[PDB]
């Protein structure tokens, strides 16, 4: 059982921070090469890979990624026929991907618009807004609004997609209302309340799970939980298969 | 009497928000298209014009010379001053559309400069007096803040880039010293922009309202008194003498 995550987006949005609220939550300079870490615990491996970039100059900035993401599938297909004969193949492709976008409060970036149109063709992406603490209430529910129209108005299919019943009864919710997660990442545990909690601990402190705070812990249960299995089984039948068909 | 101030830096900053904020306070908001300058007569004590000018995106797929639509700006005001400073008109008063102050927002992602940030600053300051300034600085801690503000000295002593106070600029052994803690000690303002007016100014936090004059929540007030008391005169006196007349000389 492996699952394999990335954070992809602009630098300085919280990425490598989200990434280990994301471990410290089931069990910071800044990147500059894609490394992956993966912890061996809940059963499952899940590892998660981190990313850079965001320059004066910034054509065809996705192909590094895109790379990749490609480069994790002929691994795979090379490694799917069972030579050594092992009983479990490992499976080092992307499952699902986090694009993080910025809470401009304006329209979306067309890099971010074009980033995320060509990986949503090769992998599985789920928008989030990053640093959400920062928006007001009135702020964050019409930045979501406008984000949901820009993507289908771009005709961007992100997980999960409507293409592949009470799964249509809750995709709707999911594709509806509560994306993007807009998320708060803290490492920094805090007694508040009488236990350890994770949180931000502006002067205000702010807690990275409280579905009162954020919707961090949505976001959590959706990629690990509800939707973990589909998340793997599209990229399997479809992005994958996809490739090794181009391929062959 | 004619102060200029220009608002730049990428999309999203809350440069505009920040614009209404100091007239509202000195006395729903869309992405903006085309430079804009907004102008208010209101009053030191006695009048005053001061016009805020708008500045679009900086943000895109290629930013290469994105700063050159400003500079020709700016430079379009600076011929237009050398093209009014002969008063064939013979006019008393001679009215001034000439950047003085341009303040400069850096998102506040909490790592080194971005280069284009870098590149940006760098043009301007050889035409134009730069005061950097922290876009949303309520999204960052305490710790963090203090960081990034060293970061950001740091960085810009590094690269070279001469914002106002200039270093060169001050003569008095006595000057340096007073400039020497407004640009090591207090640049960059960490400011909080709000233009709802809820009935002291501020941003709506969940937690509890945050006060946008407050010296205790953000430095705009800092900003505010230094560019509109303090060094409003420095600031017009240091374009006319010296950028204006670089260009002009420039210009033949
Ligand atoms: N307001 C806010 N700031 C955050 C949040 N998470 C991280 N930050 C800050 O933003 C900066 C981003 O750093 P990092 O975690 O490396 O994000 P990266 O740019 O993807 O690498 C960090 O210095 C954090 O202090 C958040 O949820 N809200
Ligand atoms: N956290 C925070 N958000 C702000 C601040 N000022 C503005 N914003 C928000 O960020 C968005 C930026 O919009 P705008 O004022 O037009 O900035 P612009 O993109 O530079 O023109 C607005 O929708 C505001 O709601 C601030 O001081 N702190
Ligand atoms: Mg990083
Ligand atoms: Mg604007």
Redo the contacts between chains.
């Keep these: 059982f492996d699952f394999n995550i990335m954070v992809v987006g602009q630098?300085?949005?919280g990425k490598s921070t989200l990434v280990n609220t994301l471990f410290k939550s089931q069990v910071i300079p800044?990147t500059v090469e894609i490394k992956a870490i993966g912890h061996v615990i809940e059963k499952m491996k899940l590892t998660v890979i981190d990313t850079p970039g965001?320059?004066?100059?910034?054509?065809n900035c996705w192909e590094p990624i895109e790379k990749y993401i490609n480069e994790q599938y002929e691994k795979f297909l090379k490694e799917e026929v069972n030579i050594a004969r092992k009983k479990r193949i490992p499976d080092t492709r992307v499952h699902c991907c986090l694009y993080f976008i910025?809470?401009?409060?304006?329209?979306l970036?067309?890099?971010d618009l074009?980033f995320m149109k060509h990986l949503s063709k090769v992998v599985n992406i789920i928008p989030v807004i990053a640093?959400a603490?920062?928006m007001?209430?009135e702020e964050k529910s019409e930045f979501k609004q406008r984000v949901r129209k820009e993507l289908e108005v771009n005709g961007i299919e992100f997980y999960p997609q409507k293409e592949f019943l009470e799964d249509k009864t809750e995709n709707d919710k999911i594709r509806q209302e509560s994306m993007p997660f807009a998320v708060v990442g803290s490492d920094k545990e805090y007694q508040v309340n009488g236990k350890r909690v994770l949180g931000?601990?502006?002067?205000?402190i702010?807690e990275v799970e409280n579905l009162n705070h954020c919707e961090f812990a949505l976001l959590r249960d959706f990629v690990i939980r509800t939707h973990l299995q589909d998340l793997k089984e599209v990229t399997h039948n479809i992005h994958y298969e996809t490739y090794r068909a181009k391929r062959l």
């Design positions: 630098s300085g949005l800044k965001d320059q004066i100059n910034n054509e910025s809470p401009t409060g304006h329209s970036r067309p890099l074009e640093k603490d920062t007001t209430l931000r601990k502006t002067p205000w702010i």
